[PDB]
Design a protein around this ligand. Structure first.
Ligand SMILES: CCCCCCCCOCCOCCOCCOCCO
Ligand SMILES: CCCCCCCCOCCOCCOCCOCCO
Ligand SMILES: CCCCCCCCOCCOCCOCCOCCO
Ligand SMILES: CCCCCCCCCCC[C@@H](O)CC(=O)O
Ligand SMILES: CCCCCCCCCCC[C@@H](O)CC(=O)O
Ligand SMILES: CCCCCCCCCCC[C@@H](O)CC(=O)O
Ligand code: NA
Ligand code: NA
Ligand code: NI
Length: 677
C-alpha cells in the first residue's frame, strides 16, 4: 500500500504504530533503531496546542520555552541544542527552507496537520544540513476517499477567536480523484499590551490515481499573517530580580504602538508523485516551492539605559524580505531477499535552493519607562542601511539499507553533501562565497524479542553550516554532530501501550568561540550533550489514555575560549517531566463527558552562558472538559473547554542572555465547538 515516503501506520488515541521519519520508508516504531516520538491529531486537539512548538510540550527531550509566550516562530530545542532551533522543521518530507539568519522563518499552522513526528539526535544521513539534537517532521492532511466535512469554532480569553473548515472527498464517479480544502481565520490580542496576532490561511490539495501504479498529489498552502504577535525580551535585572524597587509586568510591551508591524505572507506550491515500477522497485518524487514576504517594523529593548534611571535603552529594526526557495527529493527503493535476509535498499538525490533579498533598516529609539511606559515618542535615529542578497544550495546523494534477519533489524546509511552559500552586500559592494562538501554515516542494530522488548544501539552523524565568521568576514566551517544512542523499547503483544528509554551521548564540534574582547569567532569550541529520555503511552482501560515523560540532560561546553569551559548553556534544563491523562466516560451517568489534565515540570536553567544567574523552575497545569452531543441526537457535534496554565503562573520561561528574558504564557482558556460529517 506504498511504504516509500509514507508513515503508513495505524494510530489509536495518542499512540501511533509506525513512522517514516527515521528511514524515509514506513517502519514500525518497535523495529526502528532511533528514538522517535509521534504526536497525533487527537493529542494536539485534547491539549489545545495553538502552535507546533506548544504541541511538543508533552514530549521528552524537548524544551518549549525558548521565547516564552511568543508565537511568531516555532522554536523547538532538542537535547539541549538551541542555537539554530528555527531550522528543526521538515514538512511532507522536505525541509521548511526559511532562512534562519533573516526574519523569514516559516510557520505551519497545526490545523493543517495530521501528525507530528520527532526524531532525536544527528540525522543528516537522510536530510543533509540539520542540527545535532534532531528534527521535527510534520505531516499535512491528505485527501480522503469517502466524503468528509468539518467546521470548527473557538473563543478564548486574550481576545482569542478562530473559525476553520476542512472539506475532503472523492471528486469522480470512480473514486480516483480526491480533494481536500482546508481554511482558517484566527486572531488574538496576546497577554502583551498593544499587540495583535492575526492569520488567514487556505490549503487546497488534489490527489490523482493514474494507472494502477501511480499517485500524484498537488498541494497548495497560502497563509497571510497581518500581525506577528510579540517577540520582545527584557532584562533579567528586573525580571528574575527587582530593579531598584520594581518587577516589570509580564503584559509589558517594549515597543512603540505607532511603529509595530509584522506582516508575513507565505505561499507554497508542491507535489508528491508515487510510482510502483515492479514488485521490487518504487520511486517517489517530493517537491515544494516557497515564495514568502516579510515586512517588519519594531522598536525593541536592549538593556537598561545607562543615563536614564528606570528606562530601557532601545533600537529600531526594519526589514522587507522576499524569499524564494525550492526543494526536491528523489528516491528509488527496492525490497528483495538474499536467502534469509530481507533488504529495503534506498537511494536518492535531493536538492535545495534558496534566495532571500533583504533590505534592513535599523537605528536608535527614545528610552522607555519599564513600569509606567509612556508611548508616543517614536522618532528613530537611523543607522546606515544594510542590504543583502543571500543564497544557499545543498545537494545530497544518499544510500540506505535496512536489513531484516531473524529477530535482528539492521540499518546502514551514507550520504554525500554539497553546500554552497553566498551573501552579496548590495549596500557596500562586497560578496562572500563559500562551499563545503560533507560526508555522513549512520549505523544501527536492534533486536526484537519474542515478548515485545527491543534493545538497540545506534551511531550517527550530522553537519550544519556555521552561523558565525572569522576576522576576515569568512564563515566558519560547518558544525559536526556525532551521537551514540543506546535504547530500549517495549510494547506488550496484546495491549495498546508503548514504553521507551534512550541513553545518548552527542558531541558537537566546530562550534564558534570568541575571546570576550574580540568580536569575531573561531571554530574551536565543542559541546557535549548526554542524558536519558523516558516515554510512556498507556491505555490503562478503554476510557483512560496516559502520556508520561522524563528527561535528564547534561549538556556542557567542553571547549570554549569565552571562559565558559565547563558551563551549561542557557535554555537547557537538567530535568524535565510531563504527565497527561484523558478520561472519557463510557456509560453510566457521565456518558459523553471527558475530563483530562496534565502537568509539565521544567527545571532550573541558567539565564546566561557565564552561569551567573538561575531561572527558577516551574510546574504548569493544563486541564480540559469535553462533551459529545451525539449522545443526545446531534451526531457529529461536540464541544470542549480547555485551559493551559490553569493556575496562571508568572514566570520567566527562559533567558537568551541577561539582556533578554522571556515570560511564559499566562492562563489560556479556549472553548470550542466542532460539527463533523
Ligand atoms: C463544556 C463547556 C464549554 C462549551 C462551549 C461551547 C461553545 C463554543 O463557542 C465558540 C464559538 O464561537 C466562535 C465564533 O468566532 C468567530 C465569530 O466572530 C466574528 C469576529 O469578527
Ligand atoms: C509531572 C510531574 C511534576 C512533578 C514536579 C516536582 C517538582 C520537583 O522539585 C524538587 C526540587 O525542588
Ligand atoms: C517526576 C520527577 C520530577 C522532578 C525531577 C527532580 C528535580 C531535581 O531538581 C533539579 C533542579 O531543577
Ligand atoms: C479563508 C482564507 C483566506 C486566504 C488567505 C491567503 C492569502 C495569500 C495571498 C496571496 C496573494 C497573491 O496570490 C496575489 C498576487 O500575486 O498578486
Ligand atoms: C535519476 C534522475 C533524476 C530525476 C530528475 C530530477 C532532477 C533534479 C534537478 C536538481 C538540480 C541539481 O542537480 C543541480 C546541481 O546542484 O548540480
Ligand atoms: C548519480 C548521482 C549524481 C549526483 C550529482 C551531484 C551534483 C552535485 C553538485 C551540485 C552541488 C551544489 O549545491 C553546489 C555546487 O555544485 O557548486
Ligand atoms: Na535517535
Ligand atoms: Na500570527
Ligand atoms: Ni499583508
Amino acid at each position: 500500500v506504498f511504504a516509500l515516503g509514507n508513515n503508513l501506520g495505524s494510530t489509536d488515541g495518542y499512540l501511533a504504530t509506525h513512522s517514516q521519519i527515521a528511514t524515509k520508508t514506513s517502519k514500525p516504531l518497535l523495529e526502528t533503531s532511533q528514538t522517535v516520538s509521534v504526536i497525533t491529531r487527537e493529542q494536539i486537539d485534547d491539549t489545545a496546542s495553538k502552535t507546533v512548538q506548544q504541541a511538543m510540550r508533552y514530549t521528552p527531550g524537548i524544551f518549549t520555552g525558548q521565547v516564552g509566550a511568543s508565537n511568531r516562530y516555532d522554536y523547538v530545542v532538542m537535547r539541549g541544542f538551541a542555537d539554530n532551533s528555527v531550522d528543526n522543521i521538515y514538512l511532507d518530507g522536505l525541509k521548511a527552507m526559511g532562512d534562519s539568519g533573516t526574519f523569514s522563518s516559516m510557520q505551519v499552522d497545526p490545523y493543517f496537520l495530521e501528525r507530528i513526528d520527532v526524531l532525536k539526535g544527528p540525522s543528516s544521513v537522510l536530510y543533509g544540513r540539520s542540527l545535532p539534537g534532531g528534527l521535527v517532521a510534520l505531516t499535512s492532511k491528505k485527501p480522503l476517499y469517502e466524503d468528509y466535512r468539518q467546521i470548527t469554532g473557538s473563543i478564548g480569553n486574550m481576545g482569542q477567536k478562530e473559525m476553520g473548515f476542512d472539506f475532503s472527498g472523492p471528486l469522480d464517479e470512480e473514486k480516483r480523484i480526491a480533494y481536500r480544502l482546508i481554511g482558517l481565520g484566527k486572531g488574538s490580542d496576546t497577554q502583551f499590551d498593544h499587540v495583535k496576532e492575526e492569520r488567514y490561511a487556505i490549503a487546497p490539495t488534489l490527489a490523482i490515481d493514474f494507472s494502477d501504479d501511480t499517485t500524484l498529489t498537488l498541494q497548495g498552502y497560502l497563509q497571510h499573517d497581518p500581525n506577528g504577535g510579540y517577540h520582545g525580551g527584557v532584562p533579567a535585572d528586573g525580571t528574575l530580580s527587582h530593579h531598584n524597587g520594581r518587577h516589570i509586568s509580564r503584559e509589558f510591551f517594549d515597543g512603540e504602538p505607532s511603529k509595530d508591524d509584522f506582516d508575513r505572507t507565505q505561499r507554497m506550491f508542491g507535489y508528491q508523485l508515487e510510482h510502483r515500477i515492479d514488485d521490487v522497485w518504487s520511486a517517489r518524487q517530493n517537491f515544494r516551492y516557497l515564495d514568502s514576504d516579510v515586512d517588519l517594523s519594531q522598536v525593541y529593548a536592549y538593556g537598561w539605559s545607562a543615563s536614564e534611571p528606570n528606562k530601557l535603552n532601545r533600537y529600531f529594526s526594519g526589514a522587507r524580505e522576499h524569499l524564494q526557495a525550492y526543494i526536491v527529493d528523489n528516491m528509488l527503493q527496492a525490497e528483495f531477499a538474499t536467502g534469509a535476509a530481507r533488504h529495503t535498499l534506498l537511494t536518492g538525490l535531493d536538492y535545495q535552493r534558496r534566495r532571500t533579498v533583504v533590505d534592513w533598516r535599523s537605528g536608535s529609539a527614545s528610552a522607555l519607562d519599564a513600569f509606567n511606559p509612556v508611548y508616543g515618542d517614536d522618532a528613530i535615529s537611523y543607522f546606515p542601511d544594510d542590504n543583502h542578497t543571500r543564497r544557499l544550495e545543498q545537494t545530497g546523494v544518499y544510500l540506505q539499507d535496512l536489513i531484516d534477519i531473524d529477530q535482528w533489524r539492521f540499518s546502514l546509511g551514507l550520504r554525500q553533501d554539497w553546500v554552497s552559500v553566498t551573501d552579496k552586500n548590495r549596500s557596500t559592494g562586497s560578496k562572500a562565497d563559500d562551499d563545503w562538501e560533507k560526508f555522513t554515516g549512520r549505523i544501527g542494530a536492534l533486536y526484537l524479542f519474542d515478548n515485545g522488548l527491543a534493545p538497540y544501539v545506534s551511531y550517527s552523524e550530522s553537519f550544519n553550516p556555521n552561523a558565525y565568521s572569522d576576522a576576515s568576514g569568512t564563515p566558519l566551517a560547518p558544525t559536526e554532530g556525532k551521537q551514540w544512542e543506546l535504547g530500549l523499547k517495549f510494547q506488550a503483544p496484546g495491549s495498546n501501550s508503548f514504553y521507551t528509554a534512550s541513553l545518548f551521548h552527542i558531541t558537537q564540534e566546530n562550534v564558534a568561540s570568541k575571546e570576550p574582547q574580540d568580536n569575531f569567532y573561531t571554530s574551536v569550541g565543542e559541546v557535549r550533550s548526554q542524558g536519558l529520555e523516558l516515554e510512556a503511552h498507556t491505555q490503562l482501560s478503554d476510557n483512560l489514555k496516559l502520556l508520561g515523560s522524563y528527561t535528564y540532560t547534561d549538556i556542557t561546553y567542553t571547549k570554549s575560549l569565552d571562559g565558559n569551559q565547563g558551563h551549561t548553556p542557557n535554555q537547557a534544563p537538567k530535568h524535565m517531566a510531563s504527565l497527561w491523562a484523558d478520561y472519557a466516560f463510557d456509560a453510566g451517568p457521565l456518558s459523553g463527558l471527558s475530563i483530562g489534565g496534565g502537568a509539565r515540570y521544567v527545571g532550573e536553567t541558567w539565564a546566561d552562558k557565564e552561569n551567573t544567574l538561575r531561572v527558577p523552575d516551574y510546574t504548569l497545569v493544563d486541564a480540559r472538559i469535553g462533551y459529545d452531543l451525539g449522545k443526545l441526537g446531534l451526531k457529529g457535534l461536540d464541544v470542549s473547554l480547555n485551559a493551559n496554565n490553569l493556575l496562571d503562573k508568572d514566570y520567566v520561561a527562559s533567558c537568551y542572555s541577561l539582556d533578554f528574558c522571556y515570560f511564559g504564557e499566562k492562563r489560556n482558556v479556549t472553548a470550542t465547538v466542532n460539527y463533523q460529517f
